[PDB]
Every structure is written in C-alpha cells, then in structure tokens.
C-alpha cells in the first residue's frame, strides 16, 4: 500500500516504473504500482 511503499523508500505510479526501479507492491487500493 501507499504507507508501506513510501515508508520503505518507494513511490506510487499508475503506469510504468522508471528505469532502475521495479514493481514491488501496489498503492491506492491496488490501482498503482509501488516502484523501488
């Protein structure tokens, strides 16, 4: 979720994770990816 994503060093994005990050979980009721 958003809380764990952000607290653990990630960001919530709806579409693509930028280069040198990867999908690790989700945010916003699962509609977005947590990119770390």
Curated annotation (Swiss-Prot):
It comes from the Eukaryota. Blood plasma. Sperm. Highly expressed in the lower head and midpiece of sperm. Significantly reduced levels found in the sperms of asthenozoospermia and leukocytospermia patients (at protein level). Keywords: Antibiotic, Antimicrobial, Defensin, Disulfide bond, Membrane, Secreted, Signal. GO terms for biological process: antibacterial humoral response; antimicrobial humoral immune response mediated by antimicrobial peptide; calcium-mediated signaling; chemotaxis; defense response to bacterium; defense response to Gram-negative bacterium; defense response to Gram-positive bacterium; G protein-coupled receptor signaling pathway. GO terms for molecular function: CCR6 chemokine receptor binding; identical protein binding. Disulfide bonds join 5-34, 12-27, 17-35. GO terms for cellular component: extracellular exosome; extracellular region; extracellular space; Golgi lumen; membrane; microvesicle; sperm midpiece. It is found in: Secreted; Membrane. Belongs to the beta-defensin family. Has bactericidal activity. May act as a ligand for C-C chemokine receptor CCR6. Positively regulates the sperm motility and bactericidal activity in a CCR6-dependent manner. Binds to CCR6 and triggers Ca2+ mobilization in the sperm which is important for its motility. Monomer. Homodimer. This is Beta-defensin 1.
